[PDB]
Design a protein around this ligand. Structure first.
Ligand SMILES: *[C@@H]1O[C@H](CO)[C@@H](O[C@@H]2O[C@H](CO)[C@@H](O)[C@H](O)[C@H]2NC(C)=O)[C@H](O)[C@H]1NC(C)=O
Ligand SMILES: *[C@@H]1O[C@H](CO)[C@@H](O[C@@H]2O[C@H](CO)[C@@H](O)[C@H](O)[C@H]2NC(C)=O)[C@H](O)[C@H]1NC(C)=O
Ligand SMILES: *[C@@H]1O[C@H](CO)[C@@H](O[C@@H]2O[C@H](CO)[C@@H](O)[C@H](O)[C@H]2NC(C)=O)[C@H](O)[C@H]1NC(C)=O
Ligand SMILES: *[C@@H]1O[C@H](CO)[C@@H](O[C@@H]2O[C@H](CO)[C@@H](O)[C@H](O)[C@H]2NC(C)=O)[C@H](O)[C@H]1NC(C)=O
Ligand SMILES: *[C@@H]1O[C@H](CO)[C@@H](O[C@@H]2O[C@H](CO)[C@@H](O)[C@H](O)[C@H]2NC(C)=O)[C@H](O)[C@H]1NC(C)=O
Ligand SMILES: *[C@@H]1O[C@H](CO)[C@@H](O[C@@H]2O[C@H](CO)[C@@H](O)[C@H](O)[C@H]2NC(C)=O)[C@H](O)[C@H]1NC(C)=O
Ligand SMILES: *[C@@H]1O[C@H](CO)[C@@H](O[C@@H]2O[C@H](CO)[C@@H](O)[C@H](O)[C@H]2NC(C)=O)[C@H](O)[C@H]1NC(C)=O
Ligand SMILES: *[C@@H]1O[C@H](CO)[C@@H](O[C@@H]2O[C@H](CO)[C@@H](O)[C@H](O)[C@H]2NC(C)=O)[C@H](O)[C@H]1NC(C)=O
Ligand SMILES: *[C@@H]1O[C@H](CO)[C@@H](O[C@@H]2O[C@H](CO)[C@@H](O)[C@H](O)[C@H]2NC(C)=O)[C@H](O)[C@H]1NC(C)=O
Ligand SMILES: *[C@@H]1O[C@H](CO)[C@@H](O[C@@H]2O[C@H](CO)[C@@H](O)[C@H](O)[C@H]2NC(C)=O)[C@H](O)[C@H]1NC(C)=O
Ligand SMILES: *[C@@H]1O[C@H](CO)[C@@H](O[C@@H]2O[C@H](CO)[C@@H](O)[C@H](O)[C@H]2NC(C)=O)[C@H](O)[C@H]1NC(C)=O
Ligand SMILES: *[C@@H]1O[C@H](CO)[C@@H](O[C@@H]2O[C@H](CO)[C@@H](O)[C@H](O)[C@H]2NC(C)=O)[C@H](O)[C@H]1NC(C)=O
Ligand SMILES: *[C@@H]1O[C@H](CO)[C@@H](O)[C@H](O)[C@H]1NC(C)=O
Ligand SMILES: *[C@@H]1O[C@H](CO)[C@@H](O)[C@H](O)[C@H]1NC(C)=O
Ligand SMILES: *[C@@H]1O[C@H](CO)[C@@H](O)[C@H](O)[C@H]1NC(C)=O
Ligand SMILES: *[C@@H]1O[C@H](CO)[C@@H](O)[C@H](O)[C@H]1NC(C)=O
Lengths: 463, 90, 463, 463
């Protein structure tokens, strides 16, 4: 059987060491094998909306309580107005965020969009595979609103124990969501129809309505992979994409940190109410949390003291609740605005920032709705199998010192590719695939001492 | 008076644990205690009765076993550059 | 007369549907009619600065109170030092923000700057039309500081009821602003002189001192509008700008959300003091909120108990105030730093991010001072009247498969313009205006299967 | 001797005024003398980790206290679980931040890296000059953990008065840091090895392993300085860099605002504990803060009342502590994520945003570890000695209206350089150094009315 826990140090995996060279040439480490993978994040954008009927919350229909509660009426006025403000902020945040999501024009989406790319996120006509995975996997409680009351009434199943039913006694009300599932779906289907693509400039004007796959190939050229490589490996690329996407099948798990955050957004709202509800049974230095029991077993001269402790107690718990909700609302407002920008930076555009999204530059990102917020998926680049070759800082015609070039979005390397007779060859910046050095891959530059001299054949310029 | 702070490293998967005395250091640590922090220490004694305390930079620990391993994440990191690695289910 | 409220659903206006095509050509939706409009935002950057003289705040000059208050002196020490810290943070934020606003060099501004563009924001020598609209429309209270006291003294109008006069009793003091209106005006006049322009690279070094209108035309080419279009419509463009700017005439209204936020920044500071002031008349389980009345109508053995309840009550209200001010100060500090970046991203530069500013890419933004913060205006692009044409992904010489081009910052479309004899024509990415396909609008590219073949006339390359 | 304080106004230093011109030419203000300097910032990323043994914290081993404390046990359960959550968030933030710091591949670093650039930040094999300056200058308290207890025991120096020793009575425990100095050093040595460089595109794939100095020269061309200027002044540039870096020698001072912030991060953690510790000696309306003294001098019927006041008092202080720690943890989490992006925007890349870093565009930034966070240094550009010359908006061949050019990343100016016979010359955008107008510095453009006409010699196009 298993033994004792073992002493281990926290590992640090040292980076590949690439030695520095002097003079006009250098060791260039270039990946030869590229693959994709994904990263995820959850953005909580909502706090469950709330209102409280103080007269009922503090005491369950007792006049002695109301007579003493009246002395404190200004307190509950502050509670409801503060919550009124917070709920308005929640609604403005949600509508303002979806307003940025909506496109003026888009492509229709039918099954098959994606080409060789699986796109499991296409509406299952609807929502997405991802939204069903989040909503079915997260332990999010059933809504009320309709039918509601009949299932909390004696004219219904005796087994109902919904915290919503308890609201009929608590004086607490859960408020409905602002958008509904169908409008939220309309906003994200508008984003799906806006894919393919973000190139050709603008796109904030005109709309191309082109294939998904091509927007992918354009983005790959966009990170330094040459076109010849993409054309030969286009089917392999679609398969790697699908594998990276396939990872989402196991992603909606408790071992997934983004998933866990979705679950906490739910749990955090659940506890905000559970605490208001459990405080209704809490004494506050009082003999009882029940007005009915205070009255039944105590003479009137003592009952008021017990009731006053209860009231101040209940009001104190309302105070804490509101202060917490006001803070949560503002934090959610910040989160929603940050999402607004991410949709317009990574979902609607290719990112050049690093740090963000997939951990390796950027390739298409997607946004879906999630319990209490948005869930994002990001495809990242993960190059490997690097090799070391020697590269130039540029090249000159040996016979003419003023004829100098530099590589475009790549490097000039000593040729080690047997298909190239020329001493120097060109590779992209993100993938090793030596090409002849030609004008499509070069730019004319001012001469420098570090540009290598070719006395044989260098088409840019040939002469 | 001085006292001995305690923390427990617990693995919900293997249903096992190990413990640290922090800053107390192992010169003042034994498998039995006469201080005391709880009525029984028997869940640790099952294995710890055959080991002396092992001293680490995080603190003095019983049930540690020196393995000289490097791991990225034990899900029981001890902070600093140390980690308490769970054993493997049969 | 009016009837009952009606049932309506929340509308979702479906995006224009643009059908996807297979093969090497596609339906491209291109706007044919462009117009401008504006969006606004308010950034609150300040919290009104505060100090409290606890000895006076808790009790209005009573020795019995001071004797009992002494037992709690450490409390008020915490209150004043915590506020001292918050007021310092407010000052550092304001000076650090204006420091980024100031330019090293700028153009002088005289009436007429703007050319055909109205620029109602030029200093009314001063401030701006916008600043007067914000300061006159928002119900912001009169400052004290000078003359001050004489109008709160019997040697002054009997009608004064300023909350500032009440400070002489409350032990509360309102602190002066850090910059004054004239320095704030100097900082934003420095920004106005920095306009025209943000092109020519750097601008963080040299300074061109060119026309406003030209910086506009450069920005319009910058979003995909071709030059021929701008040259022919330059007067129309100035008029559309002026109309978009003209909208600001009605913008300082209660129906304007950015305006409302300015009003709330004012209201939020007003309530912070009104609450400290109203608490001075609040009992705290005490017989009276007045020490003088506690003493006058109670025997000494009872007076201390009533006074102690009052003191702890007043100290409790100071505690809540400070906790709230510390949070408000930090939130304001974040807001000010975010503004620092916006001035350096949209006012001093053209944005390429979307999400931000006008809702359609970006065209010049302006910043003005506002009650408790900054107010920003952003001009946005709103293209319409889209048409559908068929476009290429590039073009090749039919007689030579290696002679291939792609459009620059636009598209190649099948010609539908009768002035062009050639089968293909070029449009910008943000405006339909087919041009002959020439080298100014093209780039040479690697050949692809989706580039269309011209067997007739394609100047790039002609041969 | 010194006299009275004097009345002075706050100065506003008016910007250099550059007059605006009409027509097709303008006054261009161009710096002729460039120098470097530095700016600094501190990002607090950590809150010291905490746990509390409530049974010991509230009362120092007394049974009467425990009997009454038991009634409140649910309170301390909330305290420990809330802190458990906050400490987990602190650890996730730290590991997630360092994960972005680490490179997949890097250059080895040996003394001499930097070339002519001093790089006082190279590991002193280790850490950096900067880290020693921050850790030695900031009054940060000695850690415990090892040896610990022996120095708080009678079997040790009688002089120990560590607040850590007090923890053995307080029931408070300070938790260890997550990374250790050696791993943090490994992560920032990985960043140092990633320098030289951020050009050649990608770099998120391949790795060049080139000189520091060259990455500097590439960044300088990147802001509009021409190459001829850099080649002639390359030694002067290294010296100016070293002077700007040399400033860090005096930077770790109390007059340095970033330094002060580092000191406050330390002070803020120190007070969080000092307050919990001082509350242990505070009465809470109680006769004594000591249970032992309450028992010793009071009859049992009175002792429980005094003890209950003490307990509720201690529990109240734990409540405030936790609420404060939960807020501090979330603010630190935001700070750490913002740092994550800065490392990937300025340390690993050249910034084009302004606002940020050095106050003048951007040149290399560095990140080091600091007490409770990260410390950043940023080199900035400070051009001066501007001159005024007259410039064009472009140029045309006078003999051919369709042969028009525009400057690339610079301006065309009337030649005032006696080495240039041609009427027009080219300067960069960030430095005055007129060059002949040639194709390396020009682009072909559509003709405009503001382009000046050359009837003599303009190589681009010559004919
Ligand atoms: C490059 O990476 C690919 C995968 O991304 C490697 O190919 C596959 O590797 C898996 C690993 O188990 C094998 O099971 C598959 O059978 C491999 N594919 C094939 C077609 O055999 C590939 O070997 C890597 N190395 C290269 C290209 O040098
Ligand atoms: C790639 O797309 C195919 C589409 O068929 C996926 O296969 C379907 O997976 C669902 C999952 O429940 C099944 O219910 C369907 O019956 C499957 N279709 C067929 C024809 O078998 C496939 O799983 C996707 N791959 C990845 C990695 O997601
Ligand atoms: C490639 O050839 C060029 C000349 O065609 C070399 O340029 C030298 O640059 C240095 C820099 O000042 C000058 O001092 C030399 O006089 C130049 N050489 C000549 C012949 O003028 C360049 O260095 C060569 N590249 C390499 C990597 O050796
Ligand atoms: C550069 O080219 C040389 C020569 O082709 C490569 O050397 C061969 O590498 C293969 C790898 O499987 C070996 O099996 C051969 O035996 C090697 N040839 C000799 C003569 O030893 C070298 O690996 C290439 N380098 C890179 C980075 O591609
Ligand atoms: C393009 O938009 C412009 C306005 O932006 C339209 O022209 C004006 O439209 C208003 C609408 O009431 C009329 O009152 C004006 O009289 C119109 N201007 C003129 C000169 O008549 C224009 O019609 C739109 N459509 C196009 C260009 O096709
Ligand atoms: C365009 O600029 C003109 C400048 O004259 C504005 O007209 C002035 O508007 C102010 C508003 O109070 C009047 O007091 C002036 O008397 C007007 N000037 C003249 C000559 O009549 C005009 O309103 C601006 N247009 C927009 C849309 O703002
Ligand atoms: C325009 O003409 C070119 C040839 O000049 C076509 O290029 C074809 O590209 C595919 C891709 O592999 C090759 O298999 C064909 O053999 C190429 N054709 C020839 C003649 O070599 C290109 O597809 C044509 N464009 C369109 C839109 O039809
Ligand atoms: C493409 O060109 C055709 C032919 O000129 C345009 O068709 C004409 O459109 C006008 C619009 O008012 C009608 O009045 C004519 O009667 C149409 N001509 C015919 C023969 O029907 C077509 O609209 C143009 N398309 C675009 C997008 O500009
Ligand atoms: C340009 O700036 C440099 C310094 O950045 C000036 O040169 C130095 O100025 C200091 C000021 O005290 C003197 O002490 C040094 O002796 C100067 N250097 C030399 C070599 O004499 C320079 O004068 C400035 N002006 C220019 C280039 O016009
Ligand atoms: C530039 O680098 C030199 C490296 O020598 C620095 O000089 C050293 O400074 C340290 C500071 O304590 C001394 O202990 C060494 O003895 C010095 N070395 C020598 C050879 O004297 C120099 O200070 C650096 N300049 C700047 C501005 O930082
Ligand atoms: C440089 O010469 C060109 C002509 O070669 C001038 O271009 C004029 O542009 C205006 C704009 O509409 C036309 O109306 C004129 O007819 C053009 N001139 C000719 C001769 O066609 C350009 O303005 C000249 N540049 C300057 C600064 O004077
Ligand atoms: C443009 O060139 C003129 C002529 O060389 C410069 O004028 C000279 O400036 C120097 C500065 O020290 C004076 O000493 C000379 O006496 C001036 N010459 C005359 C004839 O007055 C002028 O300064 C240059 N302008 C710029 C911006 O470089
Ligand atoms: C530096 O140049 C010398 C020249 O002899 C060479 O021997 C040495 O190995 C070079 N250094 C590196 C890192 O290549
Ligand atoms: C584990 O064994 C290694 C062997 O070198 C020793 O250095 C290390 O200190 C030991 N650790 C403990 C806790 O015994
Ligand atoms: C796809 O190509 C076929 C070829 O016959 C065509 O009929 C069909 O309409 C095309 N689809 C679209 C969307 O144009
Ligand atoms: C505007 O042009 C006129 C033409 O006579 C000129 O006199 C005036 O000085 C010019 N304005 C400026 C600012 O140069």
């Amino acid at each position: 059987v298993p033994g004792e826990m073992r002493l281990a140090s926290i590992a640090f995996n040292h980076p590949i060491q690439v030695d520095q060279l002097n003079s006009s040439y250098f060791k260039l480490s270039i990946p030869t094998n590229f693959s994709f993978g994904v990263t995820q994040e959850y953005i909580q954008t909502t706090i469950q909306k709330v209102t409280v009927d103080c007269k009922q919350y503090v005491c369950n229909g007792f006049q002695k309580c109301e007579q003493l509660l009246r002395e404190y009426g200004q307190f509950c006025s502050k509670i409801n107005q503060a919550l009124h403000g917070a709920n308005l902020r929640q609604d403005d945040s949600v509508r303002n965020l979806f307003a940025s999501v909506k496109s003026s024009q888009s492509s229709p989406i039918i099954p098959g969009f994606g080409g060789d790319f699986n796109l499991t996120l296409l509406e299952p006509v609807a929502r997405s595979a991802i939204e069903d995975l989040l909503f079915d996997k997260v332990t999010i409680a059933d809504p009320g609103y309709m039918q509601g009351y009949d299932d909390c009434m004696q004219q219904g199943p005796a087994s109902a124990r919904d915290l919503i039913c308890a609201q009929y006694v608590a004086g607490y009300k859960v408020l409905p969501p602002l958008m509904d599932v169908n409008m939220e779906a309309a906003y994200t289907s508008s984003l799906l129809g806006s894919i393919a693509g973000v190139g050709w400039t603008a796109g904030l004007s005109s709309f191309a309505a082109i294939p998904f796959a091509q927007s992918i190939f354009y983005r790959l050229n966009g990170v330094g992979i040459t076109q010849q490589v993409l054309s030969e490996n286009q089917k392999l690329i679609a398969n790697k994409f699908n594998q990276a996407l396939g990872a989402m099948q196991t992603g909606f798990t408790t071992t997934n940190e983004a998933f866990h955050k979705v679950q906490d957004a739910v749990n955090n709202n659940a506890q905000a109410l559970s605490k208001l509800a459990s405080e209704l049974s809490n004494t506050f230095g009082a003999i009882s949390a029940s007005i009915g029991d205070i009255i039944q077993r105590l003479d009137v001269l003592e009952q008021d003291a017990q009731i006053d402790r209860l009231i101040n107690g209940r009001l104190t718990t309302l105070n804490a609740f509101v202060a917490q909700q006001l803070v949560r609302s503002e934090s959610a407002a910040l989160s929603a605005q940050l999402a607004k920008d991410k949709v317009n930076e990574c979902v609607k555009a290719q990112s050049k920032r690093s740090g963000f999204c997939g951990q390796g530059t950027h390739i298409v990102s997607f946004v879906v709705n999630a319990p209490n917020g948005l869930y994002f998926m990001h495809v990242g680049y993960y190059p490997s199998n690097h090799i070391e070759v020697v590269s130039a800082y540029g090249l000159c015609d040996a016979a003419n010192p003023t004829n100098c070039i530099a590589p475009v979005n790549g490097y000039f390397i000593k040729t080690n590719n047997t298909r190239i007779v020329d001493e120097w060859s060109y590779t992209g910046s993100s993938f090793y695939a030596p090409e002849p050095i030609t004008s499509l891959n070069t730019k004319y530059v001012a001469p420098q001492v570090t540009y290598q001299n070719i006395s044989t054949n260098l088409p840019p310029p040939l002469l | 008076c001085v006292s001995v702070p305690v923390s427990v490293i617990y693995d919900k998967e293997t249903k096992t644990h190990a413990t640290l005395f922090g800053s107390v250091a192992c010169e003042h640590i034994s498998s039995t205690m006469s201080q005391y922090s709880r009525s029984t220490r028997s869940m640790l004694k099952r294995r710890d009765s055959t080991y002396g305390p092992l001293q680490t930079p995080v603190g003095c620990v019983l049930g540690l076993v020196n393995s000289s391993l490097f791991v990225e994440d034990c899900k029981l990191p001890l902070g600093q550059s140390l980690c308490a690695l769970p054993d493997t289910p049969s």
